[PDB]
Amino acid sequence: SSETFEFQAEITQLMSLIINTVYSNKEIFLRELISNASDAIDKIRYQALSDPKQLETEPELFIRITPRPEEKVLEIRDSGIGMTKAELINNLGTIAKSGTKAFMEALSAGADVSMIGQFGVGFYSLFLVADRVQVISKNNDDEQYIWESNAGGSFTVTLDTVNEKIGRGTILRLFMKEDQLEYLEEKRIKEVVKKHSEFVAYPIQLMVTKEV
């Protein structure tokens, strides 16, 4: 039962810019998504300072990267606070737009795309390497929902009936661009993550398939 929503115009403008740009350093998306994951875990830990039972839906705090090469998909999972249906709509598509236009103005002047996180919109850097994204999220106060965008003017939010029901947190499922499948490889993922993983407080887990 998917509902369709319109992006704020400025968010559409930013996504079109990023999904089309020939910017050289596409690997920065991993730092930005890991940073957002870490912030989401910070939030649930902080909420749990005064309400420890909020952690019980998923007591392990982790960031997990799962390449799914047959589907040409990269998943970035956190056990952070998660987003409700209302938050997915609000935070990702229909307002979220203040740092958005300031960052585009900075880009026009020559700022590097790598500054995107300092404008608070690093999430949209995923479009450097992905044509489409599903954000699968479970907040303690709502059911699990799927937000899906292909960088158009519209996105959908759907009650999740197809993915694993996670305890708590968010999966960013990246449908990788055909020319960006290097980020599905263990060696490449490790190289990139180690450039900025030193001070991430939570374990960054790489799901690797070993043939016995």
Phi, psi and omega in degrees: 000064185291136169255138180255139182227154178266137171292146159307139187305319183295326178292317174303316179300316181295316181297318179298317175305308188289320183289340180260347191289146172267016176316138192285319194263066183297338185296345181299342183300326184293316174303316183292321182287323174295318175301314177297320177300313180300317177300320182294324175290319174309317186295314183290324176297320180291316175303320184288348175304322181252007184200070190300334181298341179297337178282344192290341176295336175197090187289342179273132182255115189205159168243129187231131180248121181236103171289139177232076190298328177299320179275359189051049185235140170241127181251131175242113188247139168230153170262040177279203193290333183076168182236137172286172175303314181297320179292320177303313180298312186287303187294327189259329187236321197254349158232279173030035202238013183280298173301339183299308182284326174301321178292319177297322176297321176296316177303316181301324181282348180119002178301146179285143177306333181294347175285358193302324182293331179286344171266006175075014184235029179301337177309318187286351173298344178301335182285355168298327186238351186235142173277338189204153180218139163250126170258108178262120188221144179227111174260151183303335186259011182210172171284171177281133185229156178241119172259129185227136183215138169247029178070015178283199171276356184228152172225165179238150170234129188226134170301131191278117175235014187233341183255164172305134174282106182280160179297311182190147174123204189216138168248126166264109179262108183264122173270105197287143171298147185302327181273001185242027183283357174299331181282006169265002186257136185303314183297316180294316180301314179299315180305311185292312184297322183292344177291334183219024182266354192303316187251023169282125186287339187252152178298137173256110186260133176250121180275114183241142177266123175250127173280129173274000000 
